[PDB]
Design a protein around this nucleic acid. Structure first.
Length: 511
RNA sequence: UAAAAAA
């Protein structure tokens, strides 16, 4: 009666009813409505129409043309290009002016979205940048030059690394290791053969990430939709968390866990922390609660000294047979850690916020095949229930192929732009918040529409995607230092996986 | 490492 895996409360009821085909036969589905997507001065709400004019392909699939980001830097930001020549030849003689041209087109392209960059600083060429060579290691000459550049970097400066060659993880890992972890300097990478095309769409996507790193907001959900994630009794936004674990960043190495968290009622920013797990292939985040301290601190700064009164914990990267341990270990770790941290932050008062835990499995064998083009929606209209040859986003299935006793459901929240879409499999593993299937399914689906670097609803709620990306970035850090850490060996966690510079601990540097 | 999607 404490820390047991939740049993099913109910089934969902909302949305357009239509049967779909799966590998285990025909099954009833419901299609949930999209939330209202919010831009600076306009919204996008998908509204049902009949199949036949491709209206349906716009659900969960918009673009920024004619729109502006909700929140951008109030002051012009300096944008410094650093060309990382990760080849053994000099770049072509045309590159210098081609890069100037691309930087100028970039700045004017993204001004239209509300981001004002100054790109007058001449681009800087760095040769011979790479991992330390050849135990003893000599720092690459490029890293020496870049290290000197970073210590001298003017303030209010965003770095654009322009990579001569893509698909170079050793160079990319080290760039992030130096720039994120050592210096905490804001930066994005761009593959030159892409950037040089001067595409407004490419530039618009690139700056989505920059704007987030600059603490901006691109799109969000409407105020009406965000009420779903606000505790009515306290009028305080729910603290939404995402965690992931990744395994074997190098062979036989300890796993890496991450925990990201929201901090206001817009859910546009998810800073996070990572840590090295205790052993290899370790799926349970034993000390996840230790990562809660910064989630609470950041939340508190944005809510006038208040701690959250509800916590929503999305857990990714987990096997079905580990669910019991997720609750008995990780949920317990969250409640016990905040029991300790809360009083340190709220002036010494008891702190025991109710937790809901939801586990996601996004790679599974289930596929949903549409049977009809139209079905009757809740207004009585005949309306598209498939898009791009796939079931409508977000088709929910919580009957037939799901557990009766356990609290699970599928949602296919995204457009299948290619291939056959894969639905996300969700489990509510723990819930102290009296959550119904309709409430949880709406939240899960809604949270797919605020992944801040895409103009689409993604296949898994944004906290999960964010946590996955932070684990991947933490793996970059582990890998960039691993060769040296092996040569001079066990090695402590903080040496294998040092914590990122305090400058960016509250920044979505991983996006 | 533009981005979602798919593998």
């Amino acid at each position: 009666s404490i820390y047991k895996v939740e049993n099913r409360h109910d089934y969902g009821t909302k949305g357009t009813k239509v049967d779909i085909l799966t590998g285990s036969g025909r099954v009833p589905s419901r299609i949930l409505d999209a939330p209202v997507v919010q831009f600076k001065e306009s919204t996008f709400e998908y509204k049902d129409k009949s199949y036949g004019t491709k209206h349906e392909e716009s659900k969960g699939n918009w673009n920024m043309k004619g729109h502006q980001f909700i929140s951008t830097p109030a002051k012009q930001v300096n944008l410094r290009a650093i060309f990382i020549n990760n080849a053994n030849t000099a770049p072509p003689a045309s590159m210098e002016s081609e890069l100037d041209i691309s930087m100028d087109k970039f700045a004017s392209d993204v001004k239209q979205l509300g981001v004002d960059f100054n790109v007058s600083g001449k681009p800087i060429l760095i040769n011979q940048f790479g991992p330390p060579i050849k135990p003893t290691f000599e720092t690459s000459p490029g890293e020496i030059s870049l290290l000197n550049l970073l210590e001298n970097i003017p303030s209010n400066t965003y770095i654009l690394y322009v990579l001569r060659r893509g698909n170079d993880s050793a160079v990319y890992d080290r760039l992030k290791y130096i720039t994120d972890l050592k210096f905490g300097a804001l930066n994005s990478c761009v593959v030159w053969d892409n950037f040089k095309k001067n595409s407004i769409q490419y530039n618009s996507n690139v700056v989505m990430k920059m704007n987030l790193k600059l603490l901006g907001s691109n799109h969000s959900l409407s105020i009406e939709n965000n009420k779903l994630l606000i505790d009515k009794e306290s009028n305080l936004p729910i603290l939404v968390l995402g965690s992931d674990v990744t395994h074997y960043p190098e062979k036989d190495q300890n796993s890496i866990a991450s925990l990201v968290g929201s901090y206001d009622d817009k859910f546009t920013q998810f800073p996070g922390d990572y840590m090295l797990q205790d052993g290899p292939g370790e799926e349970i985040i034993t000390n996840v609660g230790s990562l809660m301290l910064n989630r609470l601190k950041i939340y508190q700064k944005h809510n006038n000294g208040k701690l959250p009164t509800k916590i929503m914990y999305f857990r990714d990267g987990v096997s079905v047979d580990q669910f019991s341990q997720v609750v008995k270990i990780e949920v317990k770790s969250i409640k016990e850690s905040v029991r300790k941290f809360g009083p340190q932050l709220n002036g010494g008062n008891k702190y025991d916020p109710p937790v809901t835990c939801i586990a996601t499995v996004k790679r599974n064998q289930v596929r949903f095949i549409p049977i009809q083009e139209n079905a009757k929606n809740e207004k009585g209209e005949e309306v598209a229930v498939q898009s791009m040859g796939n079931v409508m986003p977000g088709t929910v299935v919580d009957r037939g192929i799901t557990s009766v006793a356990h609290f699970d459901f599928f949602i296919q929240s995204h457009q299948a732009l290619k291939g056959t879409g894969v639905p996300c499999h969700y489990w509510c593993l723990y819930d102290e918040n009296q959550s119904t299937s309709d409430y949880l399914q709406e939240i899960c689906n809604n949270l797919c529409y605020i992944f801040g670097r895409s103009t689409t609803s993604v296949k898994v709620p944004a906290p999960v995607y964010y946590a996955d990306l932070l684990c991947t970035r933490a793996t970059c850090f582990f890998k960039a230092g691993f060769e040296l850490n092996m040569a001079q060996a066990t090695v402590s966690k903080n040496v294998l996986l040092p914590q990122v510079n305090d400058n960016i601990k509250s920044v979505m540097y991983y996006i």
